[PDB]
Amino acid sequence: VIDAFRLINANMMVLGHEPRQTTSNLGHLNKPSIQALIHGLNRHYYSITINYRKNELEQKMLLNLHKKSWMEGLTLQDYSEHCKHNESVVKEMLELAKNYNKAVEEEDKMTQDPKRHLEEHVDVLMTSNIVQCLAAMLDTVVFK
C-alpha cells in the first residue's frame, strides 16, 4: 500500500479546469481509495501512478531469497512421519468415501462437499506418495 501524490493549485480547481490533463488512457485503471477521497484525494492533490522498474538481474537476486537448495530438492521426508500422514489421510478419505456414498445414494433416490474434499485428499495422497517414491528411487541410483 504505497501511493504518490502532487498538489493541485488552488486557482486551477476553482477555474473549473481539471487538475490534470487527460491525453491518453494510461494513468487511469487505478481505483482511488475511500480513505484518500474522504481526506480529499482530488480536492487538494492527485494520485500519480506508481510503476516499478524491475531488472532481470535484480529479479534473480530477489529469487535467491527463498530459492530452494538442491539438498532440499533431493531430500526425503521422514519415513515414520510419511506413514503416519498416509494413514491419517487414508482414514479421512475413508470417512469422506462413506459420506460421498450416502450423498450419491440420497441424491439419486430423491432425483458437492464430499466429492470435492475426497478429490483434494486423493490429490494430496497421490502427489506426496509419488514424490517420495521417486525421490527414493533417485537416491538409490545416484548415491551408488
Binding site: 497421490m126 502427489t127 509419488i130 517414491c133 521417486l134 528411487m137 533417485l138 538409490t140 541410483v141
Partner: protein, 170 residues
Amino acid sequence: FDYKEQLPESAYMHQLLGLNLLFLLSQNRVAEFHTELERLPAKDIQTNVYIKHPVSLEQYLMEGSYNKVFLAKGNIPAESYTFFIDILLDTIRDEIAGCIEKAYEKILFTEATRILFFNTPKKMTDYAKKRGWVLGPNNYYSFASQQTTIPSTELAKQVIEYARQLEMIV
C-alpha cells in the same frame, strides 16, 4: 481337404495323413499336429490304425510315458513310418534333456545314461559334446549346477509415468 465332394474317397489317404502326423511329432510341431487332428474326422482317429498310431504316440509322449513311446516303435502300421520314428527318437531325447534342464538338480552319469537313453557307454559323452550344459564331469557331473538388486531405474520410469498421466491436461 479341398475338393471332398467332387473327388471320390482315396483309400490310399489315411496312411499318408498319419505319416504327416508322425512327421509333425518328429519335428516337434505339436500345435500343427493338433490342428491336423482337428481337421481330420473324429471317427477315424479311433476307427483307423494309420491315424491312430501317431495319435497314440503323441498321447504317450504328452502323458510322459517315454518308456511306452519307445516300446511303441514296433507297431508300425506300414513301413512308410520309418526314419520318422528315428527323428522322433532324437526329439524324445531332446525333450528328456529339457526335463533334466528345468529339473533334476545335481544328476549323475549312470542314472543319466539309464534315463536319457544314450548310445554305447563309450559314446556316453554324446549330448555333453553337443548340448553340453557346461556339464563339468566332476565324476558326478554336478549338473553343472545349471538353473536382490532394486530396479530403481525401471521403478522411477513407472513413477514418472504416473506423474505424467496425473499432470497432463486431458
